[PDB]
């Protein structure tokens, strides 16, 4: 009912001890007094209720949270839309959100012509597929979808609250799903029901008769682990009992699979992955009149784990592939399958100082390429002969992506950044030269003016001398004079790049309080290719934390931010980053900390759900040499009694299947035990709605959770509303 | 892509924070 120092809920300490092997020390007994917080019991429910009530009572003292909620709701209340796609029926299809809807709605053009979108989405299109009505009570979400190549069918993956897998349904594209259609008649879908779908997409064959998908074994209620994956094929207009097993491997039950089909109908491709590193196998089958069947003959083109290989397209037996083989910034190769021993050659060579992030074939023979140089995307068009023809959108600063179908005479680019809400560009091959590139739509926001904000990139030095760039965003009236507060974000792993992105919530906060936003490109990410990742993983993981701490220290030292006013935030691996940073950094480096759904027990992560796959990133705690570098880094095992911690709000969702909430529960119990008299509050907020696989929360709930996180940060850094 | 769907990460199209909530812009990029 009321927070003060030393007023935390009583938390039983058990006598559980685990024994590990260390290469340098031999046997190490490790106490785990909060092992019981791994479980789901009455005692755990009482403990979570008491923590969550303590956190809510503290937030209730802060009258600025309700004001932030109103500011944030308004900042998100503007229409949003995707790039459109032309199907073989001659009509264009795009997603549209009115502003605050929980799931966006798939629209279809009224006429078979590219709409003039300035007239408004409802005047040029009608509803084709509204995912909000999948269940009457809103408890069902569409996680992904794919139209067939001929445009006649629409496949869609659905999750429900409480569920660990998705289910694929199929419907005719002339049978829409709307409020009106559900009130007036039957659903209008086929009886097809493809269950146990996970960690996959939907890959149609070019004859439009069916699709490939990954599934797991059927499981009765009476544990939580996904093994023995199967790549399968489902024929449209049949039931799942008739689905074909395309590939599985009982000798390697942890491996998983992906697939692709070539545009000309000639090839089926199989990808295999052994863990979360960027290494895959690649096998190739030739299709014929018999289609997809059991006993497919596989040519094992890549059959050892060594590099990342992803198919772009083919012309006859020449196959174009994006790879990092001997090329950590990536490149394009060709593999010629007409030879018995395939001949491998560079098509677009590796750029030493820019990462090849994406390549698509457009208008049958051209290639569109996105390079990421200094964490900023650049777009180029190439000929069939591999000649760089031109740069597109040369003044754009941010992140970019391509949307097209190989056979068509246009493509789109979707562009966004720290002050670019969402621009959709079109390139039309049939128009005159000099009139091919144009802007289809621009996203207009609410209350905010993106021109009021300056985004720059600066460089700092890490502990070992390494030079690291960092994005900084401010409202233009804020000075770098040692007085502003800073919010610093990070992820730090798995070769994921911390790219620019647009958030109306972040910019609203910066303008409200005169704070700055900082995004350092720390090692472990993929900003500078595979060597950047290698610089912060397994035995070099410590560098990720050193880089993040040095960024915060640089902000204060060079007067971007005031001493003691740097707050840090991150999610999942980003939560690990925040929790490890508060433990390792000197006292007073940070003024607030918010880890969301984070990893924290680095000795037991591999014992739960899909954690085994992350041995690629963190190492294996049961190998003696690797224990020696993991143990000194595990946040749960390195909390001390003698360092003041900053104000901390841990957040978790109770149904999280990817990162079990165990991790956060153990960290917060350990904090409260070790520094019970800490002058700043150490709290955990626990959401008890059990989210289904791949589902988000409702919009209204996301607005409220954002007001709580940002209001907590504001108060901890001593910021007031004017 | 396939392998990224099981990272310890917040949400496809690289949503590495909670403020990535709005995915409408890229959601049409690969639907056929």
Numbering used by the authors:
A (entry chain A): 4 to 225, 228 to 727
B (entry chain E): 3 to 13, 15 to 35
Q: What are the paper's exact sentences on this?
A:
GmPOPB is the macrocyclase responsible for macrocyclization of amatoxins, eight amino-acid ribosomal peptides with the core sequence IWGIGC(N/D)P. Amatoxins are cyclic peptides further modified by a characteristic sulfoxide cross-link between tryptophan and a cysteine, and hydroxylation (the extent of which vary). GmPOPB is an unusual enzyme catalyzing, depending on substrate length, proteolysis, or macrocyclization using the same catalytic machinery. The protein contains two domains as observed in other POP enzymes. The domain containing the putative catalytic residues (Ser577, Asp661, His698) comprises residues 1–81 and 450–728, and the other domain is a seven bladed β-propeller, comprising residues 82–449.
GmPOPB-S577A (the higher resolution of the pair) bound to the full-length substrate (35mer) belongs to space group P21 with four monomers in the asymmetric unit. For ease of discussion, we split the 35mer into four regions, the 10 residue leader (residues 1–10), the 8 residue core, 6 residue linker, and the 11 residue recognition tail. In all 35mer and 25mer complexes, the enzyme adopts the same “closed” conformation in which the lid (the propeller domain) sits on top of the catalytic domain. In both 25mer complexes the N-terminal residues of the substrate (IWGIGCN) are disordered; in the S577A–35mer complex the N-terminal two residues (MF) are missing, while in the H698A complex only the first N-terminal residue is absent. There are no large differences between the protein backbone positions in the complexes with the 35mer and 25mer substrates (root mean square deviation (rmsd) of 0.48 Å over 720 Cα positions for the S577A structures). Substrate P10, the site of proteolytic cleavage, is positioned for attack by Ser577 (the Cβ of the mutated residue is 3.3 Å from the carbonyl with plausible geometry). Tyr496 is on the opposite face of the carbonyl 2.8 Å from the oxygen and positioned to stabilize the tetrahedral intermediate from attack of Ser577. In the 35mer complex structures, residues 2–9 adopt a helical arrangement that ends up exposed to solvent at the N-terminus and makes few contacts with the protein. In the 35mer complex, the core and linker adopt a tightly packed arrangement that is wedged between the active site loops. We propose the arrangement of and interactions between C-terminal 25 residues and protein that are seen in the 35mer complex act as a kinetic trap, which can only be escaped by dissociation.
